[PDB]
Short mmCIF file of C-alpha atoms in Angstrom, two decimals:
data_model
loop_
_atom_site.label_atom_id
_atom_site.label_comp_id
_atom_site.label_asym_id
_atom_site.label_seq_id
_atom_site.Cartn_x
_atom_site.Cartn_y
_atom_site.Cartn_z
CA UNK A 24 67.43 51.08 168.22
CA UNK A 25 65.81 48.57 165.68
CA UNK A 26 65.40 45.77 168.53
CA UNK A 27 62.09 44.47 167.68
CA UNK A 28 62.52 40.93 169.61
CA UNK A 29 65.29 38.89 171.78
CA UNK A 30 64.87 35.50 172.97
CA UNK A 31 67.10 32.88 174.40
CA UNK A 32 67.83 29.79 173.08
CA UNK A 33 66.96 26.15 174.83
CA UNK A 34 70.05 26.09 176.79
CA UNK A 35 70.07 30.00 177.33
CA UNK A 36 73.37 29.86 176.00
CA UNK A 37 72.52 31.86 172.96
CA UNK A 38 70.25 34.46 172.63
CA UNK A 39 68.89 35.99 169.18
CA UNK A 40 67.35 39.21 167.93
CA UNK A 41 64.79 40.34 165.71
CA UNK A 42 65.88 43.63 163.99
CA UNK A 43 64.19 45.81 161.18
CA UNK A 44 67.04 45.12 158.89
CA UNK A 45 67.63 41.07 159.63
CA UNK A 46 68.51 39.22 162.72
CA UNK A 47 71.58 38.94 165.07
CA UNK A 48 72.48 35.97 167.01
CA UNK A 49 74.71 36.56 170.33
CA UNK A 50 76.44 34.27 172.80
CA UNK A 51 74.84 34.84 176.02
CA UNK A 52 78.02 34.44 178.35
CA UNK A 53 80.42 35.78 177.62
CA UNK A 54 78.72 38.23 175.30
CA UNK A 55 79.84 37.89 171.70
CA UNK A 56 78.32 38.65 168.07
CA UNK A 57 78.04 35.60 166.47
CA UNK A 58 76.12 36.05 163.30
CA UNK A 59 74.32 39.56 161.91
CA UNK A 60 72.33 38.29 158.75
CA UNK A 61 71.16 41.73 157.72
CA UNK A 62 69.41 42.33 154.09
CA UNK A 63 66.45 40.28 155.32
CA UNK A 64 63.65 42.91 154.39
CA UNK A 65 60.27 42.85 156.51
CA UNK A 66 61.34 43.20 159.97
CA UNK A 67 61.85 39.99 161.99
CA UNK A 68 59.56 39.98 165.19
CA UNK A 69 60.54 36.54 166.30
CA UNK A 70 63.44 34.36 166.25
CA UNK A 71 63.53 30.56 167.61
CA UNK A 72 66.85 28.86 167.82
CA UNK A 73 67.62 25.03 167.78
CA UNK A 74 70.55 25.04 170.06
CA UNK A 75 73.50 25.93 167.94
CA UNK A 76 72.89 24.51 164.87
CA UNK A 77 72.29 26.41 161.56
CA UNK A 78 68.45 26.56 161.56
CA UNK A 79 66.48 29.39 162.82
CA UNK A 80 62.71 30.08 162.69
CA UNK A 81 61.93 33.67 161.59
CA UNK A 82 58.76 35.36 161.48
CA UNK A 83 58.53 38.21 159.08
CA UNK A 84 56.88 41.56 159.46
CA UNK A 85 53.63 40.57 158.35
CA UNK A 86 53.49 37.82 160.99
CA UNK A 87 51.76 35.63 158.77
CA UNK A 88 54.74 33.57 157.27
CA UNK A 89 56.85 31.39 159.17
CA UNK A 90 60.39 30.74 157.53
CA UNK A 91 62.93 28.32 158.41
CA UNK A 92 66.29 30.05 157.46
CA UNK A 93 69.35 27.73 156.66
CA UNK A 94 72.65 30.08 158.13
CA UNK A 95 74.83 27.66 156.51
CA UNK A 96 73.13 27.87 152.93
CA UNK A 97 72.38 31.42 153.55
CA UNK A 98 68.59 30.91 152.13
CA UNK A 99 65.17 30.01 153.58
CA UNK A 100 64.40 26.49 153.30
CA UNK A 101 60.83 26.12 154.72
CA UNK A 102 58.05 28.69 154.42
CA UNK A 103 54.88 28.13 156.05
CA UNK A 104 52.03 30.81 155.65
CA UNK A 105 49.04 31.49 157.93
CA UNK A 106 45.79 33.28 157.23
CA UNK A 107 45.79 34.54 160.86
CA UNK A 108 49.11 36.36 162.62
CA UNK A 109 51.90 33.97 164.02
CA UNK A 110 52.62 34.74 167.64
CA UNK A 111 55.38 32.48 168.47
CA UNK A 112 57.40 29.56 166.66
CA UNK A 113 59.22 26.72 168.89
CA UNK A 114 61.71 24.31 167.27
CA UNK A 115 62.71 20.87 167.90
CA UNK A 116 64.91 18.30 165.68
CA UNK A 117 61.58 16.44 164.68
CA UNK A 118 58.91 19.10 165.27
CA UNK A 119 58.05 22.61 164.21
CA UNK A 120 55.48 24.32 166.77
CA UNK A 121 53.62 27.22 165.61
CA UNK A 122 51.76 29.46 168.46
CA UNK A 123 48.66 31.44 166.78
CA UNK A 124 46.41 33.87 168.71
CA UNK A 125 43.83 30.90 169.46
CA UNK A 126 45.55 27.41 168.47
CA UNK A 127 49.07 25.48 168.33
CA UNK A 128 49.72 23.69 165.27
CA UNK A 129 52.58 21.14 165.31
CA UNK A 130 54.21 20.50 161.97
CA UNK A 131 57.03 18.03 160.84
CA UNK A 132 60.74 19.36 160.26
CA UNK A 133 60.59 18.39 156.39
CA UNK A 134 60.87 20.30 153.32
CA UNK A 135 56.96 20.22 152.97
CA UNK A 136 55.91 20.08 156.73
CA UNK A 137 53.03 17.97 157.55
CA UNK A 138 50.30 19.30 160.45
CA UNK A 139 50.48 16.53 163.03
CA UNK A 140 48.22 18.09 165.88
CA UNK A 141 46.21 21.08 166.63
CA UNK A 142 45.73 22.17 170.11
CA UNK A 143 43.35 24.61 171.36
CA UNK A 144 44.13 27.58 173.70
CA UNK A 145 42.74 30.78 175.08
CA UNK A 146 43.52 34.23 173.49
CA UNK A 147 47.11 34.25 173.63
CA UNK A 148 48.45 37.28 172.10
CA UNK A 149 51.79 36.94 174.03
CA UNK A 150 52.53 33.52 172.45
CA UNK A 151 52.91 31.92 175.57
CA UNK A 152 54.23 28.12 174.71
CA UNK A 153 57.13 25.96 175.81
CA UNK A 154 58.48 23.05 174.18
CA UNK A 155 61.07 20.75 175.54
CA UNK A 156 63.81 20.08 172.92
CA UNK A 157 65.41 16.91 175.39
CA UNK A 158 65.61 13.87 173.15
CA UNK A 159 64.02 11.88 175.92
CA UNK A 160 61.26 14.46 176.44
CA UNK A 161 58.84 16.15 173.77
CA UNK A 162 56.66 17.76 176.03
CA UNK A 163 54.48 20.87 174.87
CA UNK A 164 52.69 23.21 177.42
CA UNK A 165 50.33 26.06 176.19
CA UNK A 166 47.71 27.90 178.10
CA UNK A 167 44.52 26.08 178.20
CA UNK A 168 41.15 27.49 177.21
CA UNK A 169 40.40 27.54 180.97
CA UNK A 170 41.47 31.08 182.20
CA UNK A 171 44.46 30.44 184.32
CA UNK A 172 44.97 26.75 183.50
CA UNK A 173 47.89 24.92 181.54
CA UNK A 174 47.64 22.24 179.50
CA UNK A 175 50.55 19.74 179.06
CA UNK A 176 50.93 17.33 176.11
CA UNK A 177 53.50 15.07 175.38
CA UNK A 178 54.35 15.37 171.65
CA UNK A 179 55.37 11.61 171.53
CA UNK A 180 52.85 9.89 173.18
CA UNK A 181 49.78 11.98 172.30
CA UNK A 182 47.08 9.48 172.77
CA UNK A 183 47.58 10.04 176.36
CA UNK A 184 45.09 12.29 177.80
CA UNK A 185 46.58 15.86 178.51
CA UNK A 186 47.37 17.26 181.99
CA UNK A 187 45.09 20.15 183.12
CA UNK A 188 46.97 22.20 185.77
CA UNK A 189 44.54 24.74 187.59
CA UNK A 190 47.72 27.06 187.90
CA UNK A 191 46.34 30.52 188.66
CA UNK A 192 42.71 32.17 188.58
CA UNK A 193 43.41 35.16 186.25
CA UNK A 194 45.02 35.41 182.59
CA UNK A 195 48.48 33.69 182.24
CA UNK A 196 51.37 35.96 181.55
CA UNK A 197 54.33 34.03 181.38
CA UNK A 198 55.31 30.30 181.50
CA UNK A 199 58.70 28.56 181.76
CA UNK A 200 59.80 25.17 181.65
CA UNK A 201 63.14 23.89 183.13
CA UNK A 202 66.03 22.46 181.10
CA UNK A 203 65.21 18.70 181.87
CA UNK A 204 61.85 19.23 181.13
CA UNK A 205 60.46 17.92 184.18
CA UNK A 206 59.31 21.42 185.79
CA UNK A 207 56.98 24.34 184.62
CA UNK A 208 56.82 27.59 186.35
CA UNK A 209 53.63 29.85 186.02
CA UNK A 210 52.67 33.41 186.65
CA UNK A 211 49.38 35.44 186.48
CA UNK A 212 48.64 38.83 185.16
CA UNK A 213 48.68 40.13 188.62
CA UNK A 214 52.44 39.02 189.09
CA UNK A 215 52.30 38.66 192.70
CA UNK A 216 52.53 34.81 193.26
CA UNK A 217 54.89 32.59 190.76
CA UNK A 218 54.00 28.50 190.94
CA UNK A 219 56.20 25.83 189.82
CA UNK A 220 54.51 22.53 189.05
CA UNK A 221 55.56 18.94 188.10
CA UNK A 222 55.22 18.58 184.33
CA UNK A 223 54.74 14.62 185.07
CA UNK A 224 52.36 14.86 187.69
CA UNK A 225 50.66 18.26 188.05
CA UNK A 226 51.19 19.21 191.66
CA UNK A 227 52.26 22.61 193.21
CA UNK A 228 55.95 22.05 193.83
CA UNK A 229 56.73 25.21 195.30
CA UNK A 230 54.98 28.65 195.44
CA UNK A 231 57.00 31.96 195.69
CA UNK A 232 55.92 35.53 196.23
CA UNK A 233 58.00 38.39 194.51
CA UNK A 234 55.96 41.51 195.99
CA UNK A 235 52.62 43.14 197.09
CA UNK A 236 52.08 45.58 194.06
CA UNK A 237 50.71 44.08 190.83
CA UNK A 238 53.20 43.87 188.25
CA UNK A 239 53.45 42.45 184.80
CA UNK A 240 55.87 39.28 184.74
CA UNK A 241 57.96 39.27 181.49
CA UNK A 242 60.49 36.44 181.62
CA UNK A 243 61.14 33.30 183.73
CA UNK A 244 63.68 30.80 183.72
CA UNK A 245 65.25 28.07 185.84
CA UNK A 246 68.81 27.35 186.26
CA UNK A 247 70.40 23.56 185.25
CA UNK A 248 69.52 21.82 188.33
CA UNK A 249 65.99 23.95 188.68
CA UNK A 250 67.24 25.10 192.27
CA UNK A 251 67.15 28.61 191.55
CA UNK A 252 64.77 30.50 189.31
CA UNK A 253 64.77 34.29 188.03
CA UNK A 254 61.65 36.28 187.38
CA UNK A 255 61.77 39.61 185.55
CA UNK A 256 59.21 42.36 186.18
CA UNK A 257 58.59 45.75 184.85
CA UNK A 258 61.23 48.75 184.88
CA UNK A 259 63.97 45.90 184.27
CA UNK A 260 63.43 44.39 188.06
CA UNK A 261 64.57 40.90 188.45
CA UNK A 262 64.08 38.79 191.20
CA UNK A 263 66.09 35.52 192.01
CA UNK A 264 64.47 32.98 194.31
CA UNK A 265 65.36 29.71 195.47
CA UNK A 266 63.11 26.63 194.33
CA UNK A 267 64.22 23.41 196.32
CA UNK A 268 63.23 24.78 199.79
CA UNK A 269 59.69 25.37 201.33
CA UNK A 270 61.44 27.50 204.05
CA UNK A 271 61.60 30.46 201.32
CA UNK A 272 59.01 32.26 200.04
CA UNK A 273 60.73 35.37 198.97
CA UNK A 274 63.44 36.26 196.42
CA UNK A 275 67.02 36.14 198.05
CA UNK A 276 68.28 38.85 195.54
CA UNK A 277 66.57 41.41 193.53
CA UNK A 278 68.25 43.82 191.33
CA UNK A 279 67.44 46.56 188.55
CA UNK A 280 69.06 46.81 185.11
CA UNK A 281 70.59 50.63 185.13
CA UNK A 282 68.42 52.00 182.12
CA UNK A 283 65.11 50.48 183.74
CA UNK A 284 64.10 48.90 180.57
CA UNK A 285 62.21 45.67 180.63
CA UNK A 286 64.34 42.57 180.24
CA UNK A 287 64.47 38.74 179.71
CA UNK A 288 66.31 36.85 182.44
CA UNK A 289 68.60 33.65 182.44
CA UNK A 290 71.39 32.23 184.53
CA UNK A 291 74.89 32.46 182.83
CA UNK A 292 77.89 30.47 182.90
CA UNK A 293 79.03 30.83 186.45
CA UNK A 294 76.47 29.28 188.65
CA UNK A 295 75.76 32.75 190.36
CA UNK A 296 75.35 34.50 187.58
CA UNK A 297 71.99 36.05 185.85
CA UNK A 298 72.05 37.67 182.34
CA UNK A 299 69.52 40.16 181.45
CA UNK A 300 68.79 41.27 177.99
CA UNK A 301 66.65 44.63 178.03
CA UNK A 302 64.63 46.09 175.22
CA UNK A 303 66.88 49.40 174.63
CA UNK A 304 69.68 47.38 173.55
CA UNK A 305 71.31 46.77 177.20
CA UNK A 306 73.21 43.86 178.35
CA UNK A 307 73.68 43.02 182.11
CA UNK A 308 75.50 40.34 183.98
CA UNK A 309 74.83 40.28 187.70
CA UNK A 310 76.94 38.25 190.27
CA UNK A 311 75.33 37.58 193.46
CA UNK A 312 76.71 35.82 196.82
CA UNK A 313 74.91 33.21 198.85
CA UNK A 314 73.33 35.79 200.90
CA UNK A 315 72.25 37.40 197.61
CA UNK A 316 74.42 40.52 197.72
CA UNK A 317 76.03 41.95 194.45
CA UNK A 318 79.58 40.89 193.79
CA UNK A 319 80.45 41.77 190.12
CA UNK A 320 78.32 43.87 187.67
CA UNK A 321 78.77 44.02 183.92
CA UNK A 322 77.11 46.47 181.73
CA UNK A 323 77.29 46.81 177.61
CA UNK A 324 75.36 47.66 174.48
CA UNK A 325 75.41 44.58 172.74
CA UNK A 326 73.70 46.09 169.63
CA UNK A 327 76.75 48.18 169.18
CA UNK A 328 79.49 45.57 168.91
CA UNK B 17 65.39 3.80 148.74
CA UNK B 18 68.20 5.72 150.39
CA UNK B 19 66.79 8.98 148.76
CA UNK B 20 63.48 7.80 149.53
CA UNK B 21 64.25 8.16 153.26
CA UNK B 22 66.12 11.29 153.07
CA UNK B 23 63.25 13.37 151.52
CA UNK B 24 61.16 11.90 154.34
CA UNK B 25 63.54 12.62 157.26
CA UNK B 26 63.62 15.75 159.45
CA UNK B 27 65.88 18.63 157.71
CA UNK B 28 68.26 18.79 160.71
CA UNK B 29 68.98 14.97 160.28
CA UNK B 30 69.91 15.65 156.55
CA UNK B 31 71.76 18.91 156.56
CA UNK B 32 72.91 20.36 159.78
CA UNK B 33 75.75 21.92 161.98
CA UNK B 34 75.22 21.75 165.60
CA UNK B 35 78.36 23.80 166.16
CA UNK B 36 77.55 26.28 163.55
CA UNK B 37 76.91 29.09 166.29
CA UNK B 38 79.27 27.16 168.71
#
């Protein structure tokens, strides 16, 4: 397969793949291969995009070196190395955020980056972190040291005290930020309850339940208007909830990818579309009706295009 | 002074193509 990583960009319109020979960048909806820059030897385990520009953040095989790659110039322009392993990298026009197993470091997007802030987190081997790219919102959210709590920080007005949200009681397994940067979704390791909070307040906007059996949550994502939300769990299972109606606690739709491989989920071009990128190189598009039933159903192998 | 500003600006502000992938 060669697939080591897959992740959506900030508008979920594109998704990039880290491969053992290099990286690939795809268009989410419709599916199309935009770029495949092989010959990058090392094995890319994390790719971060800054919308549809030319800069990509790549984490090598050793996971100790963050490399910014200018696809226009076809070369590495910035290289930040770390003594510990890099778990994730988040990008924005003026800041480069690097996720470590114990802390979050914010650098500048200059030729020689300048570490601006250091935030402490709990043990974060998943690399949980979200960063609003919107120009009017430089919000950064990461697991706090309090097991189950989320800490929010405005990267612009850093002097303001952070926001400690007592989200869950166990170890956090997934976090998600809406496109507008105003609402955040949380999930514990039990994976039975999903909670959405306000990033500017810190109150439970809505709590949703996916099932009774404990499952490990993989990916969570809002839509544009933050009215719907899709949650992926084990065996490629995706639940689609409604977020702006307290009269709904369950998911109005639920599907499974044909291969049953775990996947990441995000909404597509059509307002009733949900895209699922599975670990086995599978692409799955799901169209639902207002009641939740399936209408169309597209499946393909994106790594073979 | 212009070159001084450039080397002290974010790389997306200097060399970028926000439609490189679309």
